[PDB]
Nucleic acid binder design. Structure first.
Ligand SMILES: COC(=O)C[C@@](O)(CCC(C)(C)O)C(=O)O[C@@H]1C(OC)=C[C@]23CCCN2CCc2cc4c(cc2[C@H]13)OCO4
Ligand SMILES: [Mg+2]
Ligand SMILES: [Mg+2]
Ligand SMILES: [Mg+2]
Ligand SMILES: [Mg+2]
Ligand SMILES: [Mg+2]
Ligand SMILES: [Mg+2]
Ligand SMILES: [Mg+2]
Ligand SMILES: [Mg+2]
Ligand SMILES: [Mg+2]
Ligand SMILES: [Mg+2]
Ligand SMILES: [Mg+2]
Ligand SMILES: [Mg+2]
Ligand SMILES: [Mg+2]
Ligand SMILES: [Mg+2]
Ligand SMILES: [Mg+2]
Ligand SMILES: [Mg+2]
Ligand SMILES: [Mg+2]
Ligand SMILES: [Mg+2]
Ligand SMILES: [Mg+2]
Ligand SMILES: [Mg+2]
Ligand SMILES: [Mg+2]
Ligand SMILES: [Mg+2]
Ligand SMILES: [Mg+2]
Ligand SMILES: [Mg+2]
Ligand SMILES: [Mg+2]
Ligand SMILES: [Mg+2]
Ligand SMILES: [Mg+2]
Ligand SMILES: [Mg+2]
Ligand SMILES: [Mg+2]
Ligand SMILES: [Mg+2]
Lengths: 168, 104, 176, 159
RNA sequence: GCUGGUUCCCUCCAAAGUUUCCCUCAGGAUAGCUGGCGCUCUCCGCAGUUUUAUCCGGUAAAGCGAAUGAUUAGAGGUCUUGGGGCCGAAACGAUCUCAACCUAUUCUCAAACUUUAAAUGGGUAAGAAGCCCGGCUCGCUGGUGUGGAGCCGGGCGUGGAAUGCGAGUGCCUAGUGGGCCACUUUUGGUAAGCAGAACUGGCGCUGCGGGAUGAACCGAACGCCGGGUUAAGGCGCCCGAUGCCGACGCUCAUCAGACCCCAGAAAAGGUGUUGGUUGAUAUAGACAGCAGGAUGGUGGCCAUGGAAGUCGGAAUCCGCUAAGGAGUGUGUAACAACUCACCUGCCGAAUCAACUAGCCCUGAAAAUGGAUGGCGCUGGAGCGUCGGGCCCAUACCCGGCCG
RNA sequence: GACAGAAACCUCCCGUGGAGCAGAAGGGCAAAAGCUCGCUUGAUCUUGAUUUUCAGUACGAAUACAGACCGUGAAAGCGGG
RNA sequence: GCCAAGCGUUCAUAGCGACGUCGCUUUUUGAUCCUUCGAUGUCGGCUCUUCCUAUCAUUGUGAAGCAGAAUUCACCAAGCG
RNA sequence: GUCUACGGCCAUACCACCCUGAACGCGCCCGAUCUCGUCUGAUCUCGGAAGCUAAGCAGGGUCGGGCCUGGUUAGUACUUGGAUGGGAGACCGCCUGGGAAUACCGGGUGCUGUAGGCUU
C-alpha cells in the first residue's frame, strides 16, 4: 500500500453567526480571521492549527482545496491588504509592491505559494484579505451538525471543493 | 423583603472588557525589601567605586589596544535565472541595452 | 451515522503507527457501508476502537476503497446479522433480503429497521452480511419467490398522474 | 458564608504524601538559590515556619531576596480583574527549582554552539522549532499475509 | 433615604444590578462597568488561542482480600475464656455442644473515609532587559582576590514555536449598586412558574425569519434601496413553496395520530397486527379433526366407622402389550360409571411453547361550547428511514446613495 | 512473679503511633513537637519591609530580616510566647 | 388501579384483600408570594340559572356465597328527581 | 570481591526463618584506679586485649509476605465540546477529542559519592 502524504493546506469557512458564542471559540475565530459569516481563509496544517480547528469545530466547515479551487478563489475574490485597505487585485504591480521582497511577483506565483505553501506562506496568506463568500447556492444540508452525521460542520476531507464551487 | 446574597455572574465579562493586563515590568526593579546588611555593603561598594577609577581606564586602554593589534594581525532553472537577472533593474541594465542595440 | 441515499461498500484498511516497541503492527481491514469515504473512515475508527486498543490519533488509514459487486445483474438472497439498541436494551437480529447488490441489501435493511422498529442508523450496528444459497433462506417473505414458474397479476392499479388532467370528464379505469 | 481563616481548606493540600511522613531530607536545605532563579512554591506541613499562603501553592515566581533561612520571591496573583506581582517570604522547605527554565537554557546553549560552529562551513541551519508537521508519504509492506478481517461481535448480557 | 412630573432635531460611543464599610437592607461611600479630553510613540510589544517543556490539584471514577467508620453469610482451628449438660468426690481427663475468640474467604457501602486516580482546568518558560569574555569596588562573606553583589569595557542578529493584532500612558467623569432566564454542575424541599450557588450565553437595553399565539427557544443581530442566494422552519387550502406519474415499510382508533423549549399521563395487560430470540417435533408421515380400547398383581400396603385410582400423607414397581398412570378430572358413606394420559385407524404439511420488541387498544373521571392553529386528512394531509425539486429574513454576495 | 483478684507493683517480648501534644476539628510530630530532669525569662528594647481579610484601607494575627541586651548548649545553633 | 399472603365452613380473585407498588383530582388543608395596597366589597342564609359525573332513585343490561323477597359488585347513561 | 568512617536518594534497602563468612576491620568480650553516671560499671564514661563468630553485621536462599515496575481489567468506567437525538420520565445512544482503578498473571529485591584499609 502507498499512503500519500497527508495534506498540509486547508480551507476554512465560518458556517455559523455571531450570536451566542463562547469566549474561547470567539478568540480562535478572531485568530483565524473569520469574523463574519461565510468568510474563508487558507490555513496551513500542523499540530497547533489542527488543535485550534478542533476547538472551533462546531462553527466551521473546512477541508483540503484543489488547485482549481485555489485559482477560482484567488482570481474571482482576490483582494489584497495594502496599507491596511481592501484593494482589488486588478494587476500585478499591487502584488509586486507588497510582496516582491519575497520574490513572488505575479498572481501565478502567489497561487503557487498558497498551493505549495513554500517558505513565505505566512506573508502571502496575511497579504490576502479574507474571502467573502456568497450563500451556498442550492442550500446546505444541516448547519448545526457534523458532516459525518449528515451535517455541514466539521472536516470534509475533499468535498470542500464541491462546497467552494457551489458557494462561488 | 429577602434579596439576592452573592453572585459573580457578569464579573468575567466586566474584567475582560478592559482586559486582564499582566503587571507592568521595567528593566530595573526597586531595592526595597532586600536584606539591610546586604544593602549597606552594596551601597558602600557603590560609594567606593570612584577610588579604583584610574586602574580601570588604564586597563581598558591596554585592552582596546591589544584587541586592535589582534584584529589588525587577523586582517530555479538557468532560463529563469537569466530572465530574472535581465529583469533586474540595476543588474540587467547592460543586458537590456545590449538587446536593444541588437534589435537596432 | 445517517443512512443518506443508497449506501456503498468500502474496504477500509488501517494500522497503528510504528512504535519503538514493534517495528510494524498488524494490518486490519473491514467492510463498511456508508454514504462516502469520509464517514466510512469515521466508522472504521469507531469499530476498530471498539474492538482493538486503537484510536484515530494513534493509528492511520492505509487504504480506503469502494468494493464493486461481482454480479450486479443476477438477483441474490442476502442474510444479514446485526445488532441494535431499542428503547430498552439491545438485541441481536438476523434478517433476509433479496436484491442485486450487497449495498442495496444493506440500505434496504436500514430502511426496514427504521420502518419496523423505529431504530436509527446510529443505533444500528451491522456486523455480518453473506450471500445465502436459495435453499438456506429461512424467511417466508423471501422463500415464496423461489418458484421457477412464478406468476401473479397486478390487481388494483391505483391511478397516478392525477393532477395532469385535473378536471377530467371520465371516471378513471383501474382494471388493466 | 465561610471563615476567613488562614489554613481553611488546606486539609489535603498541606498534608504529606503517603508513606512519606517524618524527617525532611537534607538536599532540600542544601540546594542554593541565586537571585533571579525561577522557583516553584509547594507548601509542606512538616514545617510550620515561613509557610506560604494557600493561594500560592502550585505557583511559580522569581527570587529577588535571599536571606538566612528563607527567600523573598515575586509571584503573580490574580484578584478580581487585575493581576498583582507581589512579594512573599518563603522558608526553603516549601521551595523547588523549576526545570522549565533549565530546558530553555539547554536549548539556547545548544543553538549557540550550533550557530558558532557550522557558520564558517557556510551551510544553512534551522534553529527555530517548527511544530509537528503532517506525515509524509510512505509504503506499507504486507509481506505475505493478507490483512485479517474484523467484525463486530454479537451482544451478550454479561451484566 | 418616599410618590408624581421634568419641554427641539440629528450624529457618535454606550452600561449596572457586583466587591468592602456604614443603626445599612426603598439609602449612601468605595472598587468595578461608561464617556470625554488628551499626551508619548509606531507605521518592538500584546493575546478570554493553540503547540513544545515544566510543575501544581484529590473532584468524577474506583477500593474495602489496603487504614478509619460501617456491614451479610457460611467455613477451619483451639483451650484462649464463659454457658447447657454427661461420665467423672475431681481431673486443660474426656464427650458433645452453644457461644464468644483467632485465621483464611464472602455480600453491600461512605458529603464531613481512602492506597490509587482521570477529562476539563491553574501557574511558568519559549532570548538583545540574552549569552560570552576581560578588568575595578565592598565596611557583607571568607583557609584561599574565597563567595556574592555592584560597577566599568569589549564581542556576538538566523529577533531563536504557530496564528492574529499598532501600542503605552494621565486626568476629569455620569449612570448603576431591586435583576431575571436557559444547556450542563449543584444545596434545602414531596414538589413548585419555590428558595439558594458555579460556568457560559442571553433578556433587561433588541428590532428581524420560524415556533399559530409568547421578554429570554431555533436562526440571525439592524443606515435608505435594486438584483441574486441561503439559515432555522417548511411546500393539501387558509398561506409563498412537491399540481414529484418520489422510494421502502408500519398503523384502523365507538378517545386515532400529527414535530426542541411546550403546554399532559404511569405501573400492568391484549390470541389486534408486524418483526425477532430461544427451545421443542415433522415424510419411521407432525398440530387439528373424525374413532377404539384407560388393562392384572392390587379393593397394595402405615391409616379411616367407610375410601377400593378419583377427600387426605410417605410410597408409587412389575407381566399383558401398538396402550393404559398403584392414576388428570366428573360424580358416589365406598363403589359402580364416564372421562383424561398411551398408542393405533382415516387425511396429509409445516406445527407448538416461552420470551422479546414496534404501531394500535384497555388502564384514562370536572365542572360556559372547544381546539394537531382551523378546515380537514386514512393508496395519508398519520409514524419511521430516505431522494430530488421548490419557497423567503433587516443574514450572505454584487451595485447605487447618506453619514 | 507472696498476699494480688477483672483491676496496685516488678520483669521480659511484640508493638508506624493505633497514645500524647490545655480546649472544637483538621493537619503535623518518635534518639520528637510526646515523657522526665537541669538551667533560665526571647512573654524584654527598637526602626523599617511583607502576608492574610482587602478597597490591595484599618485593626487583629502572622512571616522574613536588621540593630541592642540576654538565656541555653561542648558546639553548630535555637529562642524575641 | 397492579401483585396475591390470607378471609370467605370448601375456594386467592361472588364479595374482600395485608406486606408492597403505580396513578388521577383540585370541592380539604398546607407550601410559595407571580397579579391586585391613587381599594377587584370577606362568612353564612335567601333567590335563580347553568354545568360536571366520581350514579342515590328512575329506563336498558351483565355477575353473585341471586330459590322467591330484599340486597351487594359492574356496564351504557346526567334525560328527570 | 569486600569492609570501615562520613553520607545522597530513602523498602528493588522492610519483615519472618534457614545457610555461609578467608584477611583487615566492625563487634561481642575482660575490668573499675582515674574522668564520669547509676538502686545496680545493666546503660553512659574510663582502662584494656584472655577468648569468640554464638549474636549483631555482610553475602545467599524461600513455587515467602511486603515494596518497585509491566500485562490484563479496558477503549471498560468517567469526561471536553455538539445536535429541533431517543425517551412520560428516570436515563440512554451517536459525533468530536481525552481516558482510569481493584481482583487475576508476570519480572526485579538496593544503586551510589568522598576518604581510608584488606584480598603478601
Ligand atoms: C371599599 O373597599 C372595600 O371593598 C373594602 C376593603 O378595604 C376592606 C378590607 C377588608 C376586607 C380587610 O375588610 C377590601 O375589601 O379589601 C380589599 C379590596 O378592596 C376593594 C379588594 C380585595 C382585593 C382583591 C380582592 N379583595 C376583595 C375583598 C377583600 C377581602 C379580604 C381581604 C382583602 C380584600 C381586598 O382580606 C381579608 O378578606
Ligand atoms: Mg442561537
Ligand atoms: Mg434556486
Ligand atoms: Mg445551539
Ligand atoms: Mg441587591
Ligand atoms: Mg430608604
Ligand atoms: Mg455604627
Ligand atoms: Mg420604588
Ligand atoms: Mg475536597
Ligand atoms: Mg463517588
Ligand atoms: Mg432561583
Ligand atoms: Mg430596569
Ligand atoms: Mg448589551
Ligand atoms: Mg435579541
Ligand atoms: Mg406551539
Ligand atoms: Mg433582497
Ligand atoms: Mg406553515
Ligand atoms: Mg458592497
Ligand atoms: Mg530532644
Ligand atoms: Mg536579633
Ligand atoms: Mg383458606
Ligand atoms: Mg422571588
Ligand atoms: Mg366589582
Ligand atoms: Mg370599586
Ligand atoms: Mg360514567
Ligand atoms: Mg562491663
Ligand atoms: Mg557475626
Ligand atoms: Mg553465624
Ligand atoms: Mg513474592
Ligand atoms: Mg560506599
Ligand atoms: Mg595465598
Amino acid at each position: 500500500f502507498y499512503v500519500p502524504a497527508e495534506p498540509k493546506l486547508a480551507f476554512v469557512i465560518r458556517i455559523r453567526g455571531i450570536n451566542g458564542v463562547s469566549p474561547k471559540v470567539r478568540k480562535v475565530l478572531q485568530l483565524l480571521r473569520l469574523r463574519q459569516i461565510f468568510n474563508g481563509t487558507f490555513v496551513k496544517l500542523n499540530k497547533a492549527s489542527i488543535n485550534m480547528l478542533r476547538i472551533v469545530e462546531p462553527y466551521i466547515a473546512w477541508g483540503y482545496p484543489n488547485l482549481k479551487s485555489v485559482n477560482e478563489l484567488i482570481y474571482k475574490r482576490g483582494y489584497g491588504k495594502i496599507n491596511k485597505k481592501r484593494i482589488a487585485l486588478t494587476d500585478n504591480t499591487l502584488i509586486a509592491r507588497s510582496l516582491g521582497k519575497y520574490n513572488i511577483i505575479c498572481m501565478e506565483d502567489l497561487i503557487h505559494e498558497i498551493y505549495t505553501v513554500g517558505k513565505h506562506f505566512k506573508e502571502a496568506n496575511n497579504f490576502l484579505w479574507p474571502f467573502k463568500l456568497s450563500s451556498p447556492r442550492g442550500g446546505m444540508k444541516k448547519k448545526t451538525t457534523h458532516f459525518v452525521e449528515g451535517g455541514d460542520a466539521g472536516n470534509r476531507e475533499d468535498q470542500i471543493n464541491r462546497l467552494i464551487r457551489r458557494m462561488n | 423583603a429577602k434579596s439576592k446574597n452573592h453572585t459573580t455572574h457578569n464579573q468575567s465579562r466586566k474584567w475582560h472588557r478592559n482586559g486582564i493586563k499582566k503587571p507592568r515590568s521595567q528593566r530595573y526593579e526597586s531595592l526595597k525589601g532586600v536584606d539591610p546588611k546586604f544593602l549597606r555593603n552594596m551601597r558602600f561598594a557603590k560609594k567606593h567605586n570612584k577610588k579604583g577609577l584610574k586602574k580601570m581606564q588604564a586597563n581598558n586602554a591596554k585592552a582596546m589596544a591589544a584587541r586592535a593589534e589582534a584584529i589588525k594581525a587577523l586582517v530555479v532553472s538557468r532560463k529563469l535565472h537569466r530572465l530574472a537577472y535581465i529583469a533586474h533593474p540595476k543588474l540587467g541594465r547592460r543586458a537590456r541595452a545590449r538587446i536593444a542595440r541588437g534589435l537596432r | 451515522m445517517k443512512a443518506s441515499g443508497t449506501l456503498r461498500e468500502y474496504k477500509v484498511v488501517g494500522r497503528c503507527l510504528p512504535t519503538p516497541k514493534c517495528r510494524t503492527p498488524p494490518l486490519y481491514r473491514m467492510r463498511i457501508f456508508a454514504p462516502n469515504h469520509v464517514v466510512a473512515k469515521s466508522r472504521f475508527w469507531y469499530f476498530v476502537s471498539q474492538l482493538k486498543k486503537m484510536k484515530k490519533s494513534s493509528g492511520e488509514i492505509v487504504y480506503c476503497g469502494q468494493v464493486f459487486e461481482k454480479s450486479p445483474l443476477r438477483v441474490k438472497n442476502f442474510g444479514i446479522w446485526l445488532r441494535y439498541d431499542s428503547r430498552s436494551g439491545t438485541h441481536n437480529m438476523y434478517r433476509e433480503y433479496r436484491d442485486l447488490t450487497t449495498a442495496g441489501a444493506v440500505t434496504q435493511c436500514y430502511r426496514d429497521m427504521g420502518a419496523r422498529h423505529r431504530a436509527r442508523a446510529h443505533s444500528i450496528q451491522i456486523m455480518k452480511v453473506e450471500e445465502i444459497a436459495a435453499s438456506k433462506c429461512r424467511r417466508p417473505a423471501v422463500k415464496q419467490f423461489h418458484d421457477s414458474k412464478i406468476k401473479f397479476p397486478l390487481p388494483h392499479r391505483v391511478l397516478r398522474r392525477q393532477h395532469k388532467p385535473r378536471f377530467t370528464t371520465k371516471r378513471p379505469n383501474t382494471f388493466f | 458564608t465561610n471563615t476567613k481563616g488562614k489554613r481553611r481548606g488546606t486539609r489535603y493540600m498541606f498534608s504529606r504524601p503517603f508513606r512519606k511522613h517524618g524527617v525532611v531530607p537534607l538536599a532540600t536545605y542544601m540546594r542554593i538559590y541565586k537571585k533571579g532563579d525561577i522557583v516553584d512554591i509547594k507548601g509542606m506541613g512538616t514545617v510550620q515556619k515561613g509557610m506560604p499562603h494557600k493561594c500560592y501553592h502550585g505557583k511559580t515566581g522569581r527570587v529577588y531576596n535571599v536571606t538566612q533561612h528563607a527567600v523573598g520571591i515575586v509571584v503573580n496573583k490574580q484578584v478580581k480583574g487585575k493581576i498583582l506581582a507581589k512579594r512573599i517570604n518563603v522558608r526553603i522547605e516549601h521551595i523547588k527549582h523549576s526545570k522549565s527554565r533549565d530546558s530553555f537554557l539547554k536549548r539556547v546553549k545548544e543553538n549557540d554552539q550550533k550557530k558558532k560552529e557550522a557558520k564558517e562551513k557556510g551551510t544553512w541551519v534551522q534553529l527555530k522549532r517548527q511544530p509537528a508537521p503532517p506525515r509524509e508519504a510512505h509504503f506499507v509492506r504486507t509481506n505475505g499475509k493478507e490483512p485479517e478481517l474484523l467484525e463486530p461481535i454479537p451482544y451478550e448480557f454479561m451484566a
